[PDB]
Amino acid sequence: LIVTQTMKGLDIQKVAGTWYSLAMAASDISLLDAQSAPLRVYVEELKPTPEGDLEILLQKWENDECAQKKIIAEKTKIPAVFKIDALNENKVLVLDTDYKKYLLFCMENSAEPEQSLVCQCLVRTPEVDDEALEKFDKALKALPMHIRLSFNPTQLEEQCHI
Amino acid sequence: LIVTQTMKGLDIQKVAGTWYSLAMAASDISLLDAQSAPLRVYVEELKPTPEGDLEILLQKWENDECAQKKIIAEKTKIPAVFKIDALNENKVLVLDTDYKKYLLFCMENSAEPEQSLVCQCLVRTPEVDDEALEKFDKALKALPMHIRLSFNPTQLEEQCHI
Ligand SMILES: O=C(O)CCCCCCCCCCCBr
Numbered sequence: 001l002i003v004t005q006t007m008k009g010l011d012i013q014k015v016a017g018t019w020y021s022l023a024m025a026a027s028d029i030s031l032l033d034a035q036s037a038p039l040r041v042y043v044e045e046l047k048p049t050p051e052g053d054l055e056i057l058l059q060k061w062e063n064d065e066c067a068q069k070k071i072i073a074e075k076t077k078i079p080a081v082f083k084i085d086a087l088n089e090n091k092v093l094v095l096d097t098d099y100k101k102y103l104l105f106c107m108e109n110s111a112e113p114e115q116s117l118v119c120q121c122l123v124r125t126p127e128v129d130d131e132a133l134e135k136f137d138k139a140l141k142a143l144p145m146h147i148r149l150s151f152n153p154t155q156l157e158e159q160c161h162i
Numbered sequence: 163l164i165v166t167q168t169m170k171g172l173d174i175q176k177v178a179g180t181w182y183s184l185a186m187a188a189s190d191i192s193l194l195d196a197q198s199a200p201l202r203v204y205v206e207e208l209k210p211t212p213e214g215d216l217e218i219l220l221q222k223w224e225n226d227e228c229a230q231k232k233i234i235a236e237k238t239k240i241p242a243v244f245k246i247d248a249l250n251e252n253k254v255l256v257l258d259t260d261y262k263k264y265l266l267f268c269m270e271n272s273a274e275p276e277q278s279l280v281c282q283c284l285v286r287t288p289e290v291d292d293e294a295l296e297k298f299d300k301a302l303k304a305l306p307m308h309i310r311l312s313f314n315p316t317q318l319e320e321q322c323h324i
């Protein structure tokens with residue numbers, strides 16, 4: 001309830017497929033700090049289940065290797081909001097998407113939200129889309145972000161972005 | 163020669179005194195990555211010498227302590243450009259400043275410049291100046307930055323920003 005942008009009319013079937021985490025931003029430097037930072041995750045594929053949920057395939061640097069994790073984001077009453085399971089009451093929110101190029105989303109804890117806010121700009125191809133990054137910065141100016149990372153084409157094609 | 167912004171009529175005597183590194187940005191994530199990242203420096207004081215040079219007092223996390231270093235930036239033919247000494251031919255450039263509130267500067271190697279570009283937004287008081295941060299982002303949009311850090315008032319008052 002910090003993000004004032006949510007997408008009207010989200011057809012989660014159309015956001016299916018391959019995605020690249022072009023940019024990331026968090027309210028805390030320690031969330032995206034190093035490669036092993038807790039919320040430094042790279043999205044691989046989004047798979048909506050027929051029930052209406054969302055299977056997320058991502059890569060995260062855990063041990064000293066690029067691990068592949070599979071998270072499930074269950075639907076709620078609001079079509080643009082999903083819930084992930086743990087002691088952390090995390091909510092994923094889709095802010096904007098044209099389905100064919102980009103998708104902007106934020107993640108936050110429902111109790112300690114502001115120290116959990118982490119947002120990303122996902123794009124379909126391994127290219128630097130300026131239009132998408134502009135929109136991402138636009139949605140970010142109203143939020144308390146303290147770190148912003150951006151990756152280049154070469155890094156987008158590597159496991160865990162090198 | 164990547165930064166297209168330099169300040170006309172820089173009176174380096176007026177930029178004397180106390181300064182806080184409110185925001186930092188680099189062309190490489192590894193330059194500002196962790197607290198011990200090579201170019202993660204926090205400006206304390208700027209002291210212009212009568213000869214026209216510039217003594218820079220900064221803090222950098224070296225060992226496992228917040229160290230205080232003293233660098234000298236010698237003047238060149240252009241009043242807004244200074245040179246620091248090492249095997250690295252680094253040039254400091256002052257892009258804009260109103261002397262009383264903020265100062266924007268970038269640093270780069272004259273041979274491997276783009277992988278050396280690191281810029282900062284310095285402000286006089288430990289407050290989040292929106293006007294200064296807007297100007298900083300404006301000067302940054304034309305440059306290849308891949309990481310952007312920002313600090314809050316509480317961190318600005320701590321050695322090495324906590
Ligand atoms: O295993 C972990 O600790 C990391 C969990 C990271 C949560 C990432 C959620 C990504 C959701 C993307 C939704 C795209 Br609509």
Ligand SMILES: O=C(O)CCCCCCCCCCCBr
Nearest residue numbers: 200203218231233254256267269
């Ligand atoms: O000792 C080191 O290795 C770090 C050198 C860092 C160079 C910092 C230069 C800061 C210049 C500020 C100028 C303000 Br006009």
